[PDB]
Design a binder for this molecule. Structure first.
Ligand code: MG
Ligand code: ZN
Ligand code: ZN
Ligand code: ZN
Ligand code: ZN
Lengths: 254, 526, 115, 98, 240, 77, 240, 98, 44, 66, 35
RNA sequence: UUUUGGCAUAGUUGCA
């Protein structure tokens, strides 16, 4: 009638992705954890682009949309930052945003590459993660792009710019022991990387008493957060959501 | 034929036809005749040799071109009249090789059969695996597809223009696309499409789309509309002048704002405008004065992109005002493959909600499985498989129609080498519950086209407003507004319903009510 | 045009209750919890944890419409145990589970980094 | 002077004839633009090729919207001059009507 | 709602593997096609030697056309049946056809085995050229591929001649759709405007605007078409 | 001397409910014990179930004659 | 000429009496929605805010219509006009005068179309009774008319770009008429061939074919999830 | 003006006799995508005429192999009357027979 | 009232009364200068 | 028009790899080898660099209106 | 000496590319107008 | 301080 005792085993940990395994857990908790990786980990991404001068070939909304998609280093600052909608200011103070300034004038004849290197932050902790650098726009001789933009805290549910994951691989039952999927010709299907069968079987023998468990994860970060930070913030956020729901439920019952 | 093939006294386009049975030799030289080049065949051998191919390989820095091929008497133009007197080989590799003889006297040989297709039909990958009505439908839809219609679109001011943010050349392409410049000006995006039944919004030839992909600019587009206007001087009857109408000096106006304009009566570029804002303040003199300023269309909205002013043919000042409007894909926007798989966006789901493979790939689009069987658009499935092979291999796949070097077996064997199921299926996980979907989903890259028919350009409603001047009924003008005709079909349909009150309400109360006074004795309206 | 704002899928507007309880009159000891501005994230996990309870005779959830943001969770229980008690116990179990998972994930990170 | 003839773009007499892609860019003209159309009052107009029956050729048909069993039409037209084409028919009267 | 939500657990698709038959099935289809072509050649040789005799009521061209048409029809449906037998239970084409949701057995045969004869105005492809359907054949060739019998399935892809004849076949479909739409409403409007005023009066008779008896009772029974239904008379067929 | 059917036709039900709902919308007296009913159509439906609608249907036979049926007289389907 | 004005398809008697443009009509693209009942139609918020229905002021709805008058056109749901007993018309997007916002019995408020309103829903060409049917308005936050999938086949509609029309009855008697005669649940059976005009369609039909197979087995949580979507469920889990 | 009007409106023949003039020869160029522009520039229009009523032209005829596209035509009341040239198809420009 | 010549890109102050022509190249197509208003986009 | 910033499907950063991709192609790499060197394993990411058409280079031929 | 069938697939498309390099897609309109 | 609007053509395109 109570919680499982989930066990973690990290198989790989690089600076761009983390691969791990969770045993002793139901399918719903693992799926919600993957869902929270994708759509509920807050990061800092550019929003509120104000363009002072844009004589480039790409129109203004194009440049703003490209700026929004640039990932920003938000490893340790995002937790103490506040949502701008909740802050008490003109919506941009240092406690709820990070200012960015771009001012590029192409004077030489050669094609000028406006990259993420040209984004100057007012806070050193928050920079573009590439600082090759992400190309924003190419400028001709005589063209200019000059703007100031901010970066607010948000999560992937609101807009995909705030999604920190570059693809979250999730798997369970690599040998199809539970037969949650029914191969018409199981011999034709390649073995998963976590499969434990020999090269004469195609599926594990069917287990009627089986239950989903030993969920394999591979969380690849776009760069704005370290992958371990993504997972820790994900679990913290889901716990926070459940605690807030418990608070509201208690208030409703009383 | 010797003289024509040598470019002697007879020019190439002259066509000679011998009716042997009727003993006639008709030579035609006039214009209007259609012809095409065919390789000449002599004694079951092409006159084309490896030397000509070597010379054509160095087409640059040799000055050997097609005209020298015609001058060498290897290829000649044949018209449809002369085709009746021509025995033509489909391909030289087999049709003229020695075997159990079908015909030992071939006069010509096709260059490639795929050239029978036109322009819009030649961008179809694997059209010979489709049903021909869907080839026709795609030939229509490629005309309707979004894309970068021209490289100098920035200076041009066309009345309507649509430009896709991130167009891509197809991963699965035809050879003939190299000569249409489709590789330079593509119209569409390669989309990871999964052909699967799901929550139910893809049903009945509709499409589920990945909301996060759209947030990343997937099929995001821009729509340019240009409004032109000229001030004129017609004797002294009146005179139009570009200037912002002030609220005191002109007795005729609308409730829309007039402060967006500058002192010259024109709106500056880089200013948002709603569907009623004024962009060209033009005042016509009253024999005070009146306004005839132009506003945006009622449903439209956007930012003034560009503003050009110049003198027309007579020398009057006139301006053209390009208005940018960024269109994001939404529910109702049309999409189509290169196989006539027309469909609207049923609903948009975030990435977590979409189903996903074992390696975290969510499809950009989901289409209904039932769009295939009555269609028999097997070329769509072969395109998906070939595109998966192309993306894994890192090489643009080939989908020339009548090519025997490529078939589904070879594509499947190539795909199996990359650790995928040979038929393109994959084990997809339900994005909501995380459970494995029982059946394995057919998923892969496929080239999709956004058609110009967005929902916002075709949504309109009316309560009441600009009636006619004669019929005193609603009419169309300034927008799509003006009601919908309750035609004879709807009239008889409601008669079948027996809904006399609703029929009367539609036809009398809520279209054009009126009342007249008529004498009781006579019958004429008094 | 008619596109809803992106923020109104997780934000409660003024005078909107996060969670509302209504007794189901069709069956004794059954309740319906309508939670606004939530999705399958909480629905599926709460449903699974409720199914782990032995005293819960029924536990299910549904989103009434994907374009809308509500989850209706129906919970029926044995006569000696209320649905509200089961719901609270399930949420506390999930919170304990995720806290333990956080601690063990931190320990695993420290071992992998040291290793 | 007798008038002004519209000029099909990228023809032998359009100013974009035989210009390299660079010069087309300097004139803000797309090098991939195929041409083949006129500009009339700023509007790009294209002439659709009109299909019609070939001239000076004998064509024998069997009408039965008339009293003739057969009919040999010949839309004879002059060469390069006198655009009005004279259509002669030589018909055979149907033997059924008697 | 219930079935759409269960389908998220089940799921349903359609792919290349659903259009693939085993090698034995392809060999059987090819053998059937070879036999059909051989017996068409025998019929042609009988016709050329004046050995074919016309059936009563049909000229010799009609007799030959009927013979070859029935030959290719039985070959086509035999190939389609053999392909249908090759279908597995997990085959999604079969799943969508047996449910009646979409498609037909003819669609499966055309996708897998043989697209079949292409017809223009209810006949084989006519000799547009001088006694030829295309410039790639010899004159006076009444073979299957010559007159527009496409033998490759949509999976296998059509040859150039086969593709062009298939486009010819689909052009009639498009044109007849166009003329159907041209005749949409015209017959219907004429009918209603003849009949719009006819109504069941409160004495249960059926009368027009001018109040003339059309039927003494509606449908000769006075019953609406809503609540009537098929039944079987139990005393008509049994013997005494 | 009534020859017409004793059953309310669907068209009779439609027009009776429409007119009575309109009358209730114009503050007409209500002939059924309502409880928190605000929509006039629902109140009219409650009246029809109670057979309390004070309306008489004049059915015209196709000879100029007519029959006046009370709503209570007819059989509600 | 005068004779030309009356003859033809676009004459006064055939272009402006048998058919004519009508006020209170909207049109847009259709899209599927399995989560709506067959008698429900999704409506964009903009169309609902543009369209209006005249609600007569009574002592029961005086407070509600007063609140809607307070909202005005700028906020949805609201109202456009107040038609007083004298017939004079007060517009609400321009008049902040609180004296003009007083309501009393007999006044009519042209309130914005809201949820539960009855609307005739039509698809041209109109070929039978079921090509125009009554639906209940459901406000959903996008720019298309969402429909149930079962109502596609009476309309002969598919979501390939097809547009559909929506007429709003403006009067209580007409609303009751559409309720009692033209609602799509009443239109399930056609009198054309005394059968249902609508059945189960593509995905749900294939899925219910697969679902009712003998070997479909569902564990405890799966059936509990499915029974949530069963509206008519009595709340008793059947014996497995 | 005489060319200009005829190219501006697409009515061909005498301007004052436009009642019996052939219409739709000149069309505004369709600039929506590059493929549409190329398809419009390579377009053939077959008028109805007296001749089209005698034999049905909408159907895809055998001689259209290699000259026009086998599968490209607008739907509705234009199927088979509006065609597009094949890729390698080239129309004779005319020459003197002397 | 500043315009930019289409050919030579010269800023010209042109009144609403006089004809429009480039004051150093004679070119007859003029584009308005970008607005000095405050312009903002959300980066979505 | 220009290389997208993110991968449309998975969201991986791709905008910082177009110039490197072209540079590898100038080093006589097969396109599969170039994409493997850039570290794009999922075919969703590979599709974008493999199919991208860079029209901004062509748009920069035209002089700016300043 | 002669084009082998294995190399014919390259040869024919070389010929077609040479054709479209020489002629282009709109020779019809331009040649008619020049004539 | 409460407006509004060109008619008739021709072409193209969407759905049935
Ligand atoms: Mg449709
Ligand atoms: Zn702040
Ligand atoms: Zn009188
Ligand atoms: Zn200048
Ligand atoms: Zn990717």
């Amino acid at each position: 009638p109570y919680a499982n005792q989930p066990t973690v085993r990290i198989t790989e940990l690089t600076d761009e992705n983390v691969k791990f395994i969770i045993e002793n857990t139901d399918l719903a908790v693992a799926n919600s954890i993957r869902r929270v990786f994708i759509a509920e980990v807050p990061i800092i991404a550019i929003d509120w682009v104000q363009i002072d001068a844009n004589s480039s070939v790409l129109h203004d909304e194009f440049i703003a949309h490209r700026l929004g998609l640039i990932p920003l280093t938000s490893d340790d600052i995002v937790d103490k930052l506040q949502y701008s909608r909740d802050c008490t200011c003109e919506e941009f103070c240092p406690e709820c945003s990070v200012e960015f300034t771009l001012d590029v004038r192409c004077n030489e004849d050669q094609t000028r590459h406006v990259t993420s290197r040209d984004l100057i932050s007012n806070s050193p902790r928050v920079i573009p993660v590439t600082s090759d650098d992400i190309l924003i726009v190419k400028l001709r001789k005589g063209q200019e792009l000059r703007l100031r933009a901010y970066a607010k805290k948000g999560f992937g549910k609101e807009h995909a710019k705030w999604n920190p994951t570059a693809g979250v691989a999730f798997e369970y039952d690599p040998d199809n022991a539970l037969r949650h999927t029914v191969y018409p010709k199981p011999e034709e299907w390649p073995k998963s990387e976590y499969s434990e069968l020999d090269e004469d079987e195609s599926q594990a023998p069917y287990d009627p008493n089986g239950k989903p468990e030993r969920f394999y994860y591979n969380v690849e970060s776009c760069g704005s957060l370290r992958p371990e930070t993504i997972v820790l913030s994900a679990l913290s956020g889901l716990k926070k959501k459940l605690s807030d729901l418990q608070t509201q439920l208690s208030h409703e019952i009383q | 034929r010797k003289l024509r093939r040598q470019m002697d006294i007879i020019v190439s386009e002259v066509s000679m036809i011998r009716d042997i049975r009727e003993r006639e030799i008709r030579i035609y030289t006039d214009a209007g005749r259609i012809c095409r080049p065919l390789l000449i065949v002599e004694k079951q051998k092409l006159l084309l040799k490896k030397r000509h191919i070597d010379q054509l390989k160095e087409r640059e820095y040799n000055n050997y071109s097609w005209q020298d091929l015609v001058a060498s008497g290897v290829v000649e133009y044949i018209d449809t009249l002369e085709e009746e007197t021509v025995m033509l080989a489909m391909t030289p590799d087999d049709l003229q090789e020695k075997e159990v003889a079908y015909c030992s006297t071939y006069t010509h040989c096709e260059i490639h059969p795929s050239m029978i297709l036109g322009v819009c039909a030649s961008i179809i990958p694997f059209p010979d695996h489709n049903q021909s009505p869907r080839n026709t439908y795609q030939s229509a839809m490629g005309k309707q597809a979004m894309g970068v219609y021209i490289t100098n679109f920035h200076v041009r001011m066309d009345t309507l223009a649509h430009v896709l943010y991130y167009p891509q050349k197809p991963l699965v392409t035809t050879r003939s696309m190299e000569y249409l410049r489709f590789r330079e000006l593509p119209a569409g995006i390669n989309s990871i499409v999964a052909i699967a039944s799901y929550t139910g919004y893809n049903q009945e030839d509709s499409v589920i789309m990945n909301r996060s992909a759209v947030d990343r600019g997937f099929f995001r587009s821009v729509f340019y509309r240009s409004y032109k206007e000229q001030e004129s001087k017609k004797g002294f009857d009146q005179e139009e002048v570009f200037e912002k109408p002030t609220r005191e000096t002109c007795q005729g106006m609308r409730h829309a704002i007039y402060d967006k304009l500058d002192d010259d009566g024109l709106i500056a570029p880089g200013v948002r405008v709603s569907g009623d804002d004024v962009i060209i303040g033009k005042t016509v003199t009253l024999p005070t004065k009146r306004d005839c300023s132009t506003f945006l269309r009622t449903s439209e909205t956007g930012i003034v992109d560009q503003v050009m002013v110049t003198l027309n043919q007579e020398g009057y000042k006139f301006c053209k005002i390009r208005v940018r409007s960024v269109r994001i894909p939404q529910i109702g926007d049309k999409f189509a493959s290169r196989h006539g798989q027309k469909g609207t966006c049923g609903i948009q789901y975030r990435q977590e909600d979409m189903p996903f493979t074992c390696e975290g790939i969510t499809p950009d689009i989901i289409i209904n499985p039932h769009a295939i069987p009555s269609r028999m658009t097997i070329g769509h499935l072969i395109e998906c498989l070939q595109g998966k092979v192309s993306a894994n291999k890192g090489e643009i796949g080939d989908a020339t129609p009548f090519n025997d070097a490529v078939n589904v077996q070879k594509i499947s064997n190539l795909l199996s080498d990359y650790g995928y199921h040979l038929r393109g299926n994959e084990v997809l996980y339900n994005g909501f519950t995380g459970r494995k979907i029982t059946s394995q989903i057919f998923i892969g890259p496929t080239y999709y086209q956004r058609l110009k028919h967005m929902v916002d350009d075709k949504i309109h409603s009316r309560a009441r407003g600009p009636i006619q001047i004669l019929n005193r009924q609603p009419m169309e003008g300034r927008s799509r507004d003006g009601g919908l005709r309750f035609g004879e079909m709807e009239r008889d349909c409601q008669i079948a319903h027996g809904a006399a009150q609703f029929l009367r309400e539609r036809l009398f109360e809520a279209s054009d009510p009126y009342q007249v006074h008529v004498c009781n004795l006579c019958g004429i309206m008094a | 045009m008619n596109a809803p704002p992106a923020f109104e899928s997780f934000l409660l507007f003024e005078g909107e209750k996060k969670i509302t309880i209504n007794k189901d009159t069709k069956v004794p000891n059954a309740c319906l919890f309508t939670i606004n501005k939530e999705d399958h994230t909480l629905g599926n996990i709460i449903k699974s944890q409720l199914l782990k309870d032995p005293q819960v005779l029924f536990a299910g959830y549904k989103v009434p419409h994907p374009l809308e943001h509500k989850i209706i969770i129906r919970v029926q229980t044995t006569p000696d145990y209320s649905p509200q008690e089961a719901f609270t116990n399930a949420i506390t179990d999930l919170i304990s589970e995720l806290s333990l998972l956080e601690e063990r994930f931190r320990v695993a990170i420290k071992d992998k980094q040291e290793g | 002077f007798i008038g002004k003839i519209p000029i099909m773009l990228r023809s032998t007499y359009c100013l974009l004839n035989g210009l390299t892609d660079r010069d087309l860019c300097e004139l803000n003209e797309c090098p991939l633009d195929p041409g083949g159309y006129f500009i009339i009052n700023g509007s790009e107009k294209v002439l659709i090729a009109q299909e019609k029956m070939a001239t000076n050729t004998v064509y024998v048909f069997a009408k039965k919207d008339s009293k003739y069993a057969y009919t040999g039409e010949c839309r004879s037209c002059l060469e390069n001059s006198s655009r009005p084409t004279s259509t002669i028919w030589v018909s055979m009267l149907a033997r059924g009507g008697q | 709602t219930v079935i759409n939500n269960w389908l998220l657990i089940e799921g349903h698709t359609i792919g290349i593997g659903d259009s693939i038959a085993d090698s034995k099935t392809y060999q059987d289809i090819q053998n059937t096609i070879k036999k059909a072509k051989q017996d068409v050649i025998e019929v042609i040789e009988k016709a050329h030697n004046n050995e074919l005799e016309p059936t009563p009521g049909n000229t010799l061209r009609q007799t030959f056309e009927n013979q070859v048409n029935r030959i290719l029809n039985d070959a086509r449906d035999k190939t389609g049946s053999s392909a249908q037998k090759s279908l597995s239970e997990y085959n999604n084409f079969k799943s969508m056809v047996v449910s009646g949701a979409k498609g037909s057995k003819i669609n499966i045969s055309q996708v897998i085995a043989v697209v079949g004869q292409q017809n223009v105005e209810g006949k084989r492809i006519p000799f547009g050229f001088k006694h030829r359907t295309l410039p790639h054949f010899i004159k006076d060739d009444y073979g299957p591929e010559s007159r527009g019998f496409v033998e490759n399935s949509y999976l296998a892809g059509l040859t150039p001649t086969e593709f062009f004849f298939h486009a010819m076949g689909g052009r009639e479909g498009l044109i007849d759709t166009a003329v159907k739409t041209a005749e949409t409403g015209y017959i219907q409007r004429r009918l209603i405007k003849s009949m719009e005023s006819v109504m069941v009066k409160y004495d249960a008779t059926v009368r027009n605007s001018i109040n003339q008896v059309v039927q003494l009772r509606y449908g000769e029974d006075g019953l609406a078409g809503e609540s009537v239904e098929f039944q079987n008379l139990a005393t008509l067929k049994p013997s005494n | 001397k009534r020859i017409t059917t004793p059953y309310m036709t669907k068209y009779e039900r439609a027009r009776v409910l429409g007119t009575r709902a309109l009358q209730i919308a114009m503050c007409a007296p209500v002939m059924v014990e309502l409880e928190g009913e605000t929509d006039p159509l629902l109140i009219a439906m409650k009246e029809l179930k109670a057979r309390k609608i004070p309306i008489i249907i004049r059915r015209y036979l196709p000879d100029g004659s007519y029959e006046d049926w009370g709503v209570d007289e007819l059989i509600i389907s | 000429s005068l004779k030309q004005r009356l003859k033809g398809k676009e004459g006064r008697v055939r272009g402006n009496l048998m058919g004519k443009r009508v006020d209170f009509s909207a049109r847009t693209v259709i899209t599927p929605d399995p989560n709506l009942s067959i008698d429900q139609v999704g409506v964009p918020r903009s169309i609902a805010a543009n369209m209006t229905f005249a609600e007569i002021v009574t002592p029961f709805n005086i407070d509600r219509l007063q609140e809607l008058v307070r909202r005005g056109n700028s906020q949805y749901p609201g109202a456009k006009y107040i038609i007083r007993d004298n017939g004079d018309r007060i517009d609400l997007r321009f008049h902040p005068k609180p004296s003009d916002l007083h309501l009393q019995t007999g006044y009519k408020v042209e309130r914005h179309m809201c949820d539960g309103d009855i609307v005739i829903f039509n698809r041209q060409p109109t070929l039978h009774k079921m090509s125009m049917m009554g639906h209940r308005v459901r406000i959903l936050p996008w720019s298309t008319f969402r429909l149930n999938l079962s109502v596609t086949t009476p309309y002969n509609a598919d979501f390939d770009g097809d547009e559909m029309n929506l007429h709003l009855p403006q009067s209580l008697e007409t609303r009751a008429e559409i309720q009692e005669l033209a609602m799509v649940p009443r239109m399930i059976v056609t009198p054309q061939s005394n059968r249902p005009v609508m059945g189960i369609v593509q995905d749900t039909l294939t899925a219910v074919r697969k679902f009712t197979k003998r070997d479909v087995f569902l564990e405890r949580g799966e059936v509990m999830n499915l029974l949530m979507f069963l509206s008519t469920w009595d709340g008793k889990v059947p014996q497995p | 003006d005489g060319l200009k009007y005829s190219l501006a409106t697409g009515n061909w023949g005498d301007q004052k006799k436009a009642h019996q003039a052939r219409a739709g020869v000149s069309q505004v160029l369709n600039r929506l995508t590059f493929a549409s522009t190329l398809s419009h520039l390579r377009r053939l229009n077959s008028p109805i005429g007296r001749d089209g009523k005698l034999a049905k032209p909408r159907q895809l005829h055998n001689t259209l192999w290699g000259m026009v596209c086998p599968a490209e035509t607008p739907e509705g009341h234009a199927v088979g009357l509006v065609k597009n040239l094949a890729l390698m198809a080239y129309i004779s420009v005319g020459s003197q027979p002397s | 009232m500043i315009y930019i010549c289409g050919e030579c890109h010269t800023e010209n102050e042109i009144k609403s009364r006089d004809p429009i022509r480039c004051r150093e190249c004679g070119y007859r197509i003029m584009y308005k200068k970008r607005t000095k208003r405050l312009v903002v986009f959300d980066a979505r | 028009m220009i290389i997208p910033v993110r991968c449309f499907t998975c969201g991986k950063i791709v905008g910082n790899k177009w110039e490197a991709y072209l540079g590898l192609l100038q080093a006589e790499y097969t396109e599969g080898d170039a994409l493997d060197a850039l570290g794009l394993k999922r075919y969703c990411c590979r599709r974008m660099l493999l199919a991208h058409v860079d029209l901004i280079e062509k748009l920069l031929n035209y002089a700016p209106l300043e | 000496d002669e084009i082998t069938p294995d190399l014919w697939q390259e040869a024919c498309w070389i010929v077609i590319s040479s054709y479209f390099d020489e002629k282009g897609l709109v020779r019809q309109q331009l040649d008619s107008f020049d004539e």
